[PDB]
Write a protein that binds this ligand. Structure first.
Ligand SMILES: Nc1ncnc2c1ncn2[C@@H]1O[C@H](COP(=O)(O)OP(=O)(O)OP(=O)(O)O)[C@@H](O)[C@H]1O
Ligand SMILES: [Mg+2]
Lengths: 232, 239, 240, 218, 233, 247, 233, 229
């Protein structure tokens, strides 16, 4: 077995592999997230239709459990690996505890897996950052973000990926109780914020919305364009 | 960069790490073995680094079996590991074939074990050379040596250590063929004193041993009285 | 011609010119002993002769040697590094014993050489370890093939020969022997022992004494490999 | 000294050229690869002279462009002519701020890649000011476009914004390339005027020089 | 080049020294030991308003009578906490007693430094943990405060400060603390030193505080309880 | 030993896997591959590089591979890594079939293989596989399909694609001349002949420096075929005739 | 430069540098001493504290009822070696219902420390012990260095500044065999005092004493328990 | 333990360089030839020993795998021995499972797949050999080549080793699909002769054939007879 130490400490105390992982994370399409009174919404940026890709095989917001979803920004293969692992653990939780999984539990699990690959032998750290959203059984809205170092926090509105600093500044200046009162106001807020990096919109965005019991909501292009117009 | 591992030959066909390890063995003091009609005699110069050590600190003669002795020079950690390996070989031989290991076979097995440490990058050559010597009614007196390269060759007289050349020029004069261990002992002390350098090193206490017809084939430390008389004769000879 | 790309001179990997430099150096180490050997194939006898250097009068001359028996019938010369030579001789003895255990009859010379050369080929493919710096020559009688003379080298080459030399003086001895084999038959009697001794004496320019060489023989009448004693060697030495 | 750093094609050399042709001193320009000399001890001589005929000439400015080729991180585990590179770097490092007083001279520098410079070269007393150079965002693109399209007869269907609106991360040198290529194909077709269709086709053609692995890294 | 398990010409494992450097990136945490109890104070360091301050679990309880405060990396602690807790529970299972503080510190210390590259495990640890912990709790022997470092070196301390501002914080803690403090006075002095170090102005939202006393189990200070202490603070 | 280690699985200082980048750089020199999904078929059009008068004709093809009864794939990169990946794909298909008694859906399969490849580029110390794949198949979930893979482990559904030499040019025409949802199998084959004729700038389609595949549903079951010489040459004659009439 | 990166790479002078750097790590630690008389063996140690509020690090541990050690270097290595020694002593009692002779324990220690210094990627034990024991052959003192090389000493002093201590020991070696327990302990304390840096005196806060003898299990004196020994110097 | 990292790695131009060097070694060996007649398949190489002291019969380069399929090489010797052994073992495993003689296409696939593993595995270097295999399976001749990269090619007629480019030109001149076995072996003997540097004695070349009767080496007297012409 290959048993070399890929990630190793450096003078001044830096995990250069971890730093390069997040440098990779900075080469991915911007993903955004906001938290409202009773709706969470995930927003991504599609690179380009290209008129020949099948957007069904390219999805970038995925569901881990019926009540939990996630969006990533970085490399794709690593994202696929983490998503499958999280799915397995959600189902194992359901089988053993007989109660629905909670957002913090799965975020903790994913962060632990990232830390493990950051401290094991012969393993390259994941260059992906995640945004987990959902509602626990109590019906409380939640938003967590996981970095490639294995660190996680909870947020009201964070943007991950390319151009994250700009979108984070926008959300930080704008996030106020007024913008979460109406679910439409929140969806439109996310659409507007994204609209500070992407160009076209409508045909250059994806949206996701989730409610208390309502399953994952994928907004169709026509409805998204209508939402942007109503914003217009 | 041709001398960083034992898994690389020099452009002229040499394994350097082995050469360096064998260089190390020339920083340790001098040891001597002389074969005679009755048996073998080992004598080692043990340097006293500090006044605070006990007598007998780091003895440099070992017993790998009840009939075999073992003199060493170089890294002592390697010497003790190889002593352990020779003991294991002897015990295994006795348990398997039901009798005391012939000394040649022990020399071969130990040398193969050392040589296997001079092929790979994952390990490094032993920094010790050593000499085995036993005696039996059948096989008679024997004295062998194995160097870091793993070469085993029989000897009528040899000196492994710092002042190896001076002793070698000295051991060549005995005519050991036609004496017994009792006089070989005085000779061994005589040499170990002739080779010792009082300008560089401070002082030493001898370690002497033998195996021969006088032991019934048992290797054992030379008794105190004989050792003292030998030391005294060597002192007188160094007028 | 002599390019280097990376570690091609440190581990057994190819050079830009398809060359394994580590194997080549290993071949270069066969000469580090300073000895030479010759083997000659006769009509009913096969002979191997070798030098015997007693560096001084403290060694036990009976122990320093380079002749060994693999089986009671197959005997070999070892040249080059001594420790590597011992290792290869042990492996050969084990292999022959296993052949007789498994297949019920003594091992042919050629097949033993093949097994040993395969071992060396594994040594020259994997890069963790280094090729051994020793070469073999084997001799014995085959049932229906006559006397056999075979050699092997670090790279894994196991050609069978009519008369061979290995060591520092490989080329001069090989030239002499090629000329002889050209002359009539490359010696065609048990006095092939004289041709080998002459070749060594000429190449090294030595004028041997009784106590400066060691011989081994195998005869069709006496297949068991025999290690010529000092009296017989002196007799042959006087003969010429 | 001022070090101009930023992504390639963003206005460093141009701004130095401008502050040169506008001021009243003797402005000198050098390429870093032009200090890599094929005889030993010639690079240090060149730098020493360059800073020698700058005090002979009253107020003076020096602009060492593409310095990255000469000042690098200074990794020690290197062999060859890199040692000479480091030795010329030491000569420069002394000239900028060393034992003697530099007189009346200023030093500008450029580097597309700056994370790889030596800490002692760009340290405070050697280079006090350090300038980032971002790409044009949305409107500087319009400005540059109208700057380079300035001298050419264009058809009255030129949807310039349509070319600018796309967030293709265009660079200033890319804008110049687009202008020139469009003008050249307009010449090819004999047409007395340049058409919007030509500009969009030229844009597609210039961007065609991007390449790379698409899914990888994203 | 330069394996993980390598000795500098001074006699220091390089990886250990670099791990000790990473503890300066971490926020500043304090601990004070008094006869009436032991207290832990740390700085949450809210980067941006947009994140829930409650979601920075930077003090956790090992057992009802132990407490832990950390500085360094978020991710590196998690495994050390789990080890400490499973060891405490293991001891309770076997001996039906309460795991002492020095013993849990020792077990956590052993778990550190068992890192390497050659012949260890299919997935053993590679680099040393880059986190400095603070265990404080009440044992059969009374209030205790222990300090751990990436070198597997632990020592019981009367007052310690770990983190980006550990120096200066330590001079303050040394000038103030005496052998006869009171728990509440300890909370006050700790909160004051923290206020003195943080860049931001202290508020109940951007700190956490915990005390453990002989009677009450490990206690987390609540937002209102935090305000109550900070107002007079 | 760290001295000789290559570190084929470690990040660079800008978060890009170099061995992966070079692997994708190898593909851009092997034969071109083309994908076109029709409304009634799928088709692979790669170039036959083994163009010598002294090579022999063997097997039903030279670059197209069957994987199930209802799936086939073509390769660009190294031939030997190609063989290794093809074998593992066949094994995956049969393992799914054994567990479920249903043919493996297409994205089932493509993601299983890409997971192997990704894992291979994540840990282990080996070099990555220098192969990029094009697949074709039918399953009751999405009908006729056309996927693609890369040394990284990323895949993608493509209505039309090109992986290999002159990929930029081929995808450029494929963008210019693709009718999304308005393509018969015959039209797709003609478009393939045209695009390839462009790309294989060396001479013109010799009907022998090319490989074509078709996957269709016939009589309720999939049918896979590799176009013979006569039909290919007839198609090329039709193409030249159409271009001549056009001029 | 390239001969001091791995432990398996002989240097062209017949020296392995990593082993020497490990020796350095052992020499940078705090001072310690060992003695043997005809009746007892006494270890005397000098703990030191990182700050003025932290405790002084323990540096004498128990192995068996008839053996004791005193460490100097990286603690984690010392803890590992203590684990090994204690397991060996327990196994000897379980199998043979008898105390393990000291010499044999030191031999096993040497052999265990030998394996690291001959395999690629492993590193020498960066700790220096001073084992004191009492077997059927009577009192013993041994020393262990990172190179797997143990010494049968009658008195020694490892650690930082230990050379003045060694000088005093070699100065009075004649009396040690005839001394009472009190005089022996006073010799050890006096030497370890020769090690102290001028304006620093022996106190109850920076000394620990260990003793083993004919009818006396190994016992550790520390804190105020050491005052009876110190009072008299 | 053993190195667990690949020693062949991609270069910036996307080329596995070690494989290129192995190919260089192959191109620097002894010549070899193979033709596929209408009713047989012929291999032939050159075995010019270095002196009169080498037993021509001691070793052979054209070696069979089963009664009906055999192979020759050009490159390094010991690697050829290893690959001969592996091929014989794989053939016997196929026979044991299926109780039928192994087809040549499959044996070539299997030996080549064994050849790929050493391009990617850890701590090993590529084989410095190319083989040609001949078989008579399904009443039909087969000629395959296998190189260090693990790639195989079906050949109508080929020539590898030193001066292989000129040999391929020759064979391109002299192939005629309606060829007969004796003419094919004659043409081969010639191709080796196109560059040989000496007189082709019976004891300086080898040949092996395959037909319905079975793959079988040619005895030297047979070789001399064929060389008569
Ligand atoms: N804002 C701008 N105004 C005018 N011209 C511009 C602008 N930005 C870029 N350019 C064009 O960029 C061209 C490139 O020259 P310039 O001096 O800007 O290069 P640079 O940024 O120094 O490049 P490099 O990083 O390769 O050294 C100039 O000819 C100028 O035409
Ligand atoms: Mg510029």
């Amino acid at each position: 077995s290959y048993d070399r130490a890929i990630t190793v400490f450096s003078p001044d105390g830096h995990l250069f592999q971890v730093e390069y992982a997040q440098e990779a994370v900075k080469k991915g399409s911007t993903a955004v997230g906001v938290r409202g009174r009773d709706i969470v919404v995930l927003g991504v940026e599609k690179k380009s239709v290209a008129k020949l890709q099948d957007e069904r095989t390219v999805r970038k917001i995925c569901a881990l459990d019926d009540n939990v979803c996630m969006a990533f920004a970085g490399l794709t293969a690593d994202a696929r690996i983490v998503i499958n692992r999280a799915r397995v653990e959600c189902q194992s939780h359901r089988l053993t505890v007989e109660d629905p999984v909670t957002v913090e539990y799965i975020t903790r699990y994913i962060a632990s897996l990232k830390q493990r690959y950051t401290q094991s032998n012969g393993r390259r750290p994941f260059g992906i950052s995640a945004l987990i959203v959902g509602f626990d059984f109590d019906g409380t809205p939640r938003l967590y973000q996981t970095d490639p170092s294995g660190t996680y926090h909870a947020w009201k509105a964070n943007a991950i990926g390319r151009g994250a600093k700009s979108v984070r500044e926008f959300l930080e200046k704008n996030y106020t109780d007024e913008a979460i009162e109406t679910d439409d106001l929140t969806i439109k807020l996310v659409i507007k914020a994204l609209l500070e990096v992407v160009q076209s919109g409508g045909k250059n965005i994806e949206l996701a919305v989730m409610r208390r019991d309502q399953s994952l909501k994928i907004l169709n292009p026509e409805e998204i364009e209508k939402y942007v117009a109503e914003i217009e | 960069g041709y001398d960083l591992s034992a898994s690389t030959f020099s452009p002229d066909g040499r394994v350097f790490q082995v050469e360096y390890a064998m260089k190390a063995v020339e920083n340790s003091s001098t040891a001597i073995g002389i074969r005679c009609k009755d048996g073998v005699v080992f004598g080692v110069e043990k340097l006293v680094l500090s006044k605070l050590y006990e007598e007998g600190s780091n003895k440099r003669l070992f017993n790998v079996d009840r009939h075999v002795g073992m003199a060493v020079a170089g890294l002592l950690a390697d010497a003790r590991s190889l002593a352990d390996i020779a003991r294991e070989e002897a015990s295994n031989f006795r348990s398997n074939f039901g009798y005391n290991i012939p000394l040649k076979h022990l020399a071969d097995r130990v040398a193969m074990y050392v040589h296997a440490y001079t092929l790979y990058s994952a390990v490094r050559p032993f920094g010790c050379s050593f000499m085995l010597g036993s005696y039996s009614v059948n096989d008679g007196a024997q004295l062998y040596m194995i160097d870091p390269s793993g070469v085993s060759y029989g000897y009528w007289g040899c000196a492994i250590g710092k002042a190896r050349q001076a002793a070698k020029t000295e051991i060549e004069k005995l005519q050991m063929k036609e004496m017994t261990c009792r006089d070989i002992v005085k000779e061994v002390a005589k040499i170990i004193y002739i080779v010792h350098d009082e300008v560089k090193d401070k002082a030493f206490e001898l370690e002497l041993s033998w195996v021969g017809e006088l032991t019934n084939g048992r290797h054992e430390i030379v008794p105190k009285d004989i050792r003292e008389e030998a030391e005294k004769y060597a002192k007188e000879s160094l007028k | 011609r002599g390019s280097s790309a990376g570690f091609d001179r440190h581990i057994t990997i190819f050079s830009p010119e398809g060359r394994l430099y580590q194997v080549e150096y290993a071949f270069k180490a066969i000469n580090q002993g300073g000895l030479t050997s010759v083997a000659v194939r006769g009509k009913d006898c096969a002979v191997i002769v070798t030098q015997k250097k007693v560096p001084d009068k403290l060694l036990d001359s009976s122990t320093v040697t380079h002749l060994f028996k693999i089986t009671e019938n197959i005997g070999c010369v070892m040249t080059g590094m001594t420790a590597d030579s011992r290792s290869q001789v042990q492996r050969a003895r084990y292999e022959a014993a296993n052949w007789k255990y498994k297949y019920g009859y003594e091992i042919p010379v050629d097949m033993l050489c093949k097994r040993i050369a395969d071992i060396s080929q594994v040594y020259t493919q994997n890069a963790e370890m280094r090729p051994l710096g020793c070469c073999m020559i084997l001799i014995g009688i085959d049932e229906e093939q006559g006397p056999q003379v075979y050699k092997c080298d670090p790279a894994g080459y196991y050609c069978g020969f009519k008369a061979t030399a290995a060591g520092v003086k490989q080329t001069e001895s090989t030239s002499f022997l090629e000329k002889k084999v050209k002359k009539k038959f490359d010696w065609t009697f048990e006095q092939t022992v004289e041709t080998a001794i002459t070749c060594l004496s000429t190449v090294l320019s030595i004028d041997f004494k009784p106590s400066e060489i060691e011989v081994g023989v195998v005869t069709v009448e006496n297949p068991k490999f025999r290690i010529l004693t000092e009296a017989e060697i002196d007799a042959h030495l006087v003969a010429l | 000294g001022v070090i101009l750093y930023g992504p390639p094609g963003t206005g460093k050399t141009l701004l130095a050229k401008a502050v040169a042709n506008q001021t009243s001193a003797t402005f000198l320009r050098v390429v870093g690869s032009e200090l890599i000399q094929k005889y030993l001890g010639d690079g240090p001589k060149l730098v020493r002279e360059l800073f020698r005929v700058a005090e002979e000439h009253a107020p003076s400015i020096v602009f060492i462009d593409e310095i990255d080729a000469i000042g690098t991180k200074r990794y020690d585990s290197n062999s060859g002519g890199e040692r000479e590179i480091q030795r010329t770097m030491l000569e420069l490092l002394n000239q900028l701020d060393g034992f003697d007083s530099r007189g009346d001279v200023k030093v500008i520098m450029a580097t597309n890649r700056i994370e790889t410079l030596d800490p002692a070269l760009i340290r405070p007393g050697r280079i006090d000011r350090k300038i980032e150079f971002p790409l044009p965002d949305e409107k500087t693109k319009k400005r540059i476009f109208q700057i380079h399209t300035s001298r050419m007869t264009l058809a009255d269907d030129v949807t310039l914004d349509d070319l600018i609106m796309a967030k293709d991360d265009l660079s200033g040198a890319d804008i110049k390339a687009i202008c020139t290529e469009a003008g050249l194909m307009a010449l090819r077709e004999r047409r007395m005027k340049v058409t919007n269709e030509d500009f969009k086709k030229s844009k597609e053609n210039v961007l065609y020089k991007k390449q790379e692995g698409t899914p990888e890294g994203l | 080049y330069r394996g993980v398990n390598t000795f500098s010409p001074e006699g220091r494992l390089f990886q250990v020294e670099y791990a000790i450097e990473a503890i300066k990136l971490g926020s500043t945490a304090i601990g004070i030991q008094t006869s009436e109890g032991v207290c832990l104070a740390v700085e949450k360091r809210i980067t941006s308003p947009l994140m829930e301050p409650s979601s920075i679990e930077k003090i956790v309880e090992i057992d009802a009578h132990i407490g832990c405060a950390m500085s360094g990396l978020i991710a590196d602690a998690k495994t050390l906490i789990d080890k400490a807790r499973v060891e405490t529970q293991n001891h309770w299972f076997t001996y039906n007693e309460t795991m002492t503080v020095e013993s849990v510190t020792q077990a956590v210390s052993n778990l550190a430094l068992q890192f390497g590259e050659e012949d260890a495990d299919p997935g053993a640890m590679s680099r040393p943990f880059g986190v400095a912990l603070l265990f404080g709790g009440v044992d059969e022997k009374g209030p205790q405060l222990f300090h751990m470092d990436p070198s597997g070196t632990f020592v019981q301390c009367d007052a310690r400060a770990i983190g980006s501002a550990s120096e200066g914080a330590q001079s303050s803690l040394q000038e103030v603390y005496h052998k006869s403090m009171t728990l509440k006075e300890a909370i006050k002095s700790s909160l004051i030193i923290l206020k003195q170090v943080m860049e931001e102005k202290l508020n109940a939202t951007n700190i956490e505080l915990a005390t453990v006393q002989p009677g009450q189990n490990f206690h987390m200070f609540t937002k209102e309880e935090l305000e109550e202490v900070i107002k007079d603070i | 030993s760290r001295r000789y280690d290559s570190r084929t699985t470690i990040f660079s200082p800008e978060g890009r896997l170099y061995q992966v980048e070079y692997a994708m750089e190898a593909i851009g020199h092997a034969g071109t591959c083309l994908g076109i999904l029709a409304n009634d078929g799928v088709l692979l059009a790669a170039e036959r590089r083994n163009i010598h008068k002294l090579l022999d004709e063997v097997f039903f093809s030279e670059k197209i591979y069957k994987l199930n009864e209802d799936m086939a794939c073509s390769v660009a990169g190294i031939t030997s890594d190609a063989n290794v990946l093809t074998n593992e794909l066949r094994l995956i298909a049969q393992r799914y079939l054994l567990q479920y008694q249903e043919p493996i859906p297409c994205e089932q399969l493509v993601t299983a293989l890409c997971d192997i490849k990704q894992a291979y580029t994540q840990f282990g110390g080996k070099r990555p596989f220098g192969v990029s794949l094009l697949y074709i198949g039918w399953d009751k979930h999405y009908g006729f399909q056309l996927y693609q893979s890369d040394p990284s482990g990323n895949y993608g559904g493509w209505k039309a694609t090109c992986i290999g030499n002159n990929s930029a040019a081929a995808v450029s025409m494929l963008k210019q001349d693709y009718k999304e949802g308005e393509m018969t199998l015959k039209s797709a084959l003609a478009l393939a002949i045209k695009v390839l004729n462009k790309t294989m700038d060396v001479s013109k389609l010799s009907a022998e420096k090319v490989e074509i595949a078709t996957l269709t549903r016939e009589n309720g079951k999939t049918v896979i075929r590799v176009l013979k010489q006569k039909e290919v040459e007839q198609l090329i004659k039709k193409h030249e005739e159409e271009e001549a009439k056009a001029e | 430069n390239q001969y001091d990166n791995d432990v398996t790479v002989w240097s062209p002078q017949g020296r392995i540098h990593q082993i020497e750097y490990a020796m350095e790590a052992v020499k940078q630690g705090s001072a310690t001493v060992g003695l043997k008389s005809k009746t007892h063996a006494v270890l005397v140690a000098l703990k030191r504290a990182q700050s003025e509020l932290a405790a002084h690090q323990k540096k004498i541990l128990h192995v068996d009822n008839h053996i004791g050690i005193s460490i100097a270097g990286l603690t984690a290595d010392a803890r590992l070696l203590c684990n090994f020694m204690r397991q060996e002593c327990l196994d000897s009692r379980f199998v043979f219902d008898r105390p393990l002779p000291v010499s044999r324990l030191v031999s096993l220690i040497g052999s265990k420390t030998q394996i690291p210094t001959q395999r690629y990627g492993r590193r020498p034990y960066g700790v220096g012990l001073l084992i004191a024991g009492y077997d059927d052959m009577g009192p013993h003192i041994f020393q262990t260095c990172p190179s797997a090389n143990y010494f049968d000493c009658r008195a020694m002093s490892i650690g930082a500044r230990s050379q003045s201590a060694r000088t005093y020991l070699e100065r009075h070696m004649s009396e040690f065999m005839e001394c009472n327990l009190n005089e022996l302990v006073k010799h050890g304390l006096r030497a370890l005092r020769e090690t102290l840096p001028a304006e620093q005196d022996l106190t109850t806060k920076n000394v620990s004493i260990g003793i083993v003898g004919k009818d006396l299990e190994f016992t550790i004196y520390d804190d105020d328990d050491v005052s009876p020994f110190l009072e008299g110097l | 333990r053993g190195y667990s990292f690949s020693l062949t790695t991609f270069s910036p131009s996307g080329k596995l360089v070690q494989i290129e060097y192995a190919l260089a070694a192959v191109a620097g060996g002894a010549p070899s030839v193979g033709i596929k007649a209408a009713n047989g398949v012929v291999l032939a190489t050159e075995k010019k020993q270095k002196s009169i002291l080498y037993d021509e019969r001691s070793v052979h380069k054209v070696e069979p795998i089963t009664k009906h399929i055999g192979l020759v090489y050009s490159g390094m010797g010991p690697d050829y021995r290893v690959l001969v052994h592996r091929a014989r073992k794989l053939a016997q495993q196929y026979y044991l499972v299926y109780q039928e003689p192994i087809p040549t296409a499959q044996l070539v696939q299997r030996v080549a797949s064994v050849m790929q593993e050493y391009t990617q595995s850890g701590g090993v270097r590529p084989f410095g050999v190319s083989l040609l295999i001949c078989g008579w399976n399904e009443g039909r001749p087969y000629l395959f080549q296998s190189d260090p990269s693990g790639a195989y090619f079906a050949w109508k007629a080929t020539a590898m080793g030193k001066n292989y480019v000129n040999g391929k030109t020759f064979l391109e001149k002299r192939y005629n699909e309606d060829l007969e076995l004796e003419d094919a072996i004659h043409t081969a003997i010639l191709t080796l002769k196109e560059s040989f540097e000496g007189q082709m004695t019976e004891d300086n070349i080898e040949v092996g054939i395959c037909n319905e009767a079975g793959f079988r080496r040619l005895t030297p007297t047979e070789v001399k007879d064929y060389l008569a012409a």
